[model samples]
Target: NLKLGFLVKQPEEPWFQTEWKFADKAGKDLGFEVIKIAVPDGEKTLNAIDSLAASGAKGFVICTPDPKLGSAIVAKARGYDMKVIAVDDQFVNAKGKPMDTVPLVMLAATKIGERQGQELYKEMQKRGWDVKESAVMAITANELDTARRRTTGSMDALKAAGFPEKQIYQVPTKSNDIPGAFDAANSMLVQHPEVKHWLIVGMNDSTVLGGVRATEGQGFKAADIIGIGINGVDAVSELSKAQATGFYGSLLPSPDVHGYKSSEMLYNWVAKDVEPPKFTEVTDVVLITRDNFKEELEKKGLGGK
Candidate 1:
C-alpha cells in the first residue's frame, strides 16, 4: 500500500493529537497508510524522514518544532524524491513569508490575532477604559513566524483602536501550554504592582489564561481584567467553567480540517499528480465565549466535558 508520512512537534499535546487523529482517518478512508510520528528534535525528525523515505513514503507532512528547519526538511524529502508539505508552521524565508517551495495547511495568523484584538478592544470600550492610566495590557509572544504575525496583527488593531504603545507590554514565553505562561505572567505582575487593570492577549487561549491565573490573588478584580486569543479544544472547556478567571473568549481553530486537508492534498498529489493550492487557507475558526462555547464545541467536534 502507498504511504504518507506525518510528523508532529508535540505528540502529547491534545491539539497535535487531534491533528494526527484526523490525518490518520483521512489516510484510512483514502486508501493510504499514514505513518505518523511525533519528533520534537532535529535529529529525531531527520531520522523519521529518512525512515519514512526508506519505507516508500510518497509525501511528507512535516510539523516541525523549529520553523527554521522547514526548508531543510523539505529539501531532505526532495532528495529522496518525496513530495512535501508543511502543517502548523511553514517554511518561511528571511522576509517572514511562507516559502513557495512547500505549501502549508495552518492558521490564518494575522486574521486570528486581528479578531482577538478587535474583541478585546470592544470589551475595553464597553468598560470605558478609554483613558484609564492604570489599565495596562500585556501580549504574550513567541518565536514562530505565525506567532510574530499574530502579535503584529494584535498590536496593529490595538494601535488603530488608540491603545497607548507604552502601556502595552510584550511578555516572552515558551509554549502555548498553561504553566510556562503562568510563570511569565506572574513575573510581569510582580514587576508592576502599581498597575490596577490587566489586559491579556496571546497566540493561544492557554497563553491568555496564564495571565489570568497569575492575577488571581495579586490584587485584580474579575471585572478589571480580560484575556483573549485563538486556541484549540481546552480553551473552550476552560471558558465554560464558572471559576475560569480572566478568560474572556477565544477564536477556536479547526485542527481536524488542517490534518484532513493536508493528507487529502498529499494523497491526490502522489496518486493523481494533482497540485494543491499554494495556500490552503481554512476559514473554520470562530470566536467563542463562555455563553456560546457549549454549542460551539459540539459543532467543533469537541464534546463538552
Candidate 2:
C-alpha cells in the first residue's frame, strides 16, 4: 500500500478540520494510506516529519504556520528520499529558494484577499456608499506569512482603486482566534464609533464573526457596515443568515477543493510518475454573498461537506 503524510499547523482549528476531512476522504478515494499529524510549532513539525519518515511515508503535504522553519523540514525530508508538496503556503527560505523536496505549492491566500477587496468594493457600490469616503478596518493575524499576504493583497486592491492609506486601519489579532479577534474588533468599534461607512475585513471566518458581533453589540446597523471574511468553512451558515440582514460576504476557496486537488496531484506524481511543476498551483476563490452562497457551494462541489 502506498503511504503518504499530511502535516497541519493546528488540528483543532475549524479551517484545518475541514481541510483534514476532505484530505482524508481524498486519500481513501485515491487508495493511499495517509498519515496525518498536527504540529503547533516549528520544532514539533520537524519531529513529526522524522516520525512519519520512520513509518515509511514516501510523500508529504504540509500546511505550515512558519514557512521559514517548515522549508528546513521539507529539505530534511527530501534527504530521506521523500517528495513534499506544500499546501496553503509556500515553504521557502529567506533568500527565496524553495525547498528542494517540495515539488509544488498550493496557495490561494493572496487571491482570496484580492477577492475580498473586490467584493468590498461591489458591496459598497450596491449600498450606495462611496469607496473614497469609507473608513476601512482590517483584522488579521501577525504570525503567519499567509496572513500578511492576505492583508497586503486586499490593501493593494483598495489602493489601486484610489482608496487612501490614511483612511485604512489595521488591527492585529495576535492570532486568528475568536477571543483576540473579538477584543481587537471591539476595541476598534469603541475607538471609531464616530466614523461612518465602515468596511471591516477579517482574515478568516472566525475573526470576521467576531467583528460582526462587535458591530451588532455596538448598535451599528447592517446598512452602515460592510464585512468580508476568508475561508468558507463554518462561515457558510453564518453567511447564509447574514443575507438580507447585513452586508457580509466571504472569500470562499473551499478547503475541500484544496484537499482533493492536492491529494490527486500527489497521487499522480507518485503513481504515474507525472512530474509536478516547480511553481505554485493556485485554486479558485469565489466571493460568497447571501444572494449566491448556495450556488457557490454547489459550483465548488462542496455542498455535501
Candidate 3:
C-alpha cells in the first residue's frame, strides 16, 4: 500500500489534533496509509521526515511555520524524489524568496488580520470607546513575514476606519509564543499607566490571552480592554469558561479545512496523477463569539478534541 505523511511541531495543539484526525480519515477512505509525527524542533522534525521517507512515503505534507526548516525539508525530500507540500506556512528559499517550487495550503493571512481589526473597530464603536480619549491599540508584534502581514492588515483596516496611528503600539514578544506576550504587555502597562482602555490584537488567539492576563493582573477590569485575536481554539475555550474571559472576539476559520482539504489535494495529486493548484487559500473565516462557539466550531467537526 502507498503511504502519505504529515509532520507537525505540536501534536498537543488543538489545530494539529484536528488536522491529524482528518488526515487519517482521508487516508483510510482514499486507499493509503497515513503516518503523522509531531516534534517541536527542526532537528527532530527532520528526523521524523527521514523516517517517513525511509518508511516508503510517496509524498509528505509539512505543517510547521519555520521557513528555514521548511526550506531544508523541501531540499531533503526532493533529493529522495518525494513530492512535498507545505501546510499552514509557506516555505521560502534561503535567500528569503517564496519558493514557488513547493505548493502550500493556508488560511488567508492579510484578510484575516483586516477582518479582526474591523471587528475590534466595531466593538470599540459599540462601547463608545472610539470616542474615549484614553483608548489605545496594542498589537503583539513579530518578525515572521506572515504574522507581520496580519499586523499590517490590522493596521490597514484600523487606518481605513480612521483610528489614529499615533495611538497604536506594537509590543515585541520574545518567545513568539503565548506567554512571551505577557512581558511585552506588562512593559506597555508600566509605560502607559495613563491609558485607560486597551484594544489588544495579536499574531494568534493565545497571544491575545497573554496580554489580557497581563492587564487583569495589573487590576484592569475585563470591561476596560478589548482583545481580538485570530484562531478561535484558545479564545472559545476561555470565553466558554465558568467565569468567562473578557475577550472581545476571535477570527474563526474551520481548522479541519486545512487538514482535510490539503490531504484531499495531496491525494488527488499523487493517487490520480492530477495536478492540484500550486496554492490553496482558506477564504471562509469569520468573527466568533462565546455564545455561538459550538455552532461555529461544529460546522467543520472542530467542536471536540
**Candidate number of the best TM-score:** 3
* Higher-ranked by TM-score: 2 or 3: 3
Q: Sort by TM-score, best first: what order?
A: 3, 1, 2
- TM-score for candidate 1: 0.90
lDDT of each residue in 1-305, candidate 1, tens digit only:
99998899888666777788889889889999899888888889989988997898888787887776766787788799899888878776655566866878888888887777788888878877645554444555556877777877887788788888777877887665678788888878888776777778777766777778888858777777888867657575577676745777878888888888899999999899898887877667778887888788787776674
Model 2 lDDT per residue over 158-196, tens place: 877767788888888866666777788888878875576
Range of the 10 consecutive residues with the lowest summed lDDT in candidate 2: 238-247
The count of backbone overlaps in candidate 1 is 0
Better of 1 and 2 by lDDT: 1
Model 1 deviation from native, Cα RMSD in Å = 2.3
lDDT of 3: 0.77
Give the backbone clash total of model 2.
0
* Clashing residue pairs for model 1: none
Q: Candidate 1, which ten residues in sequence have the lowest lDDT sum?
A: 130-139
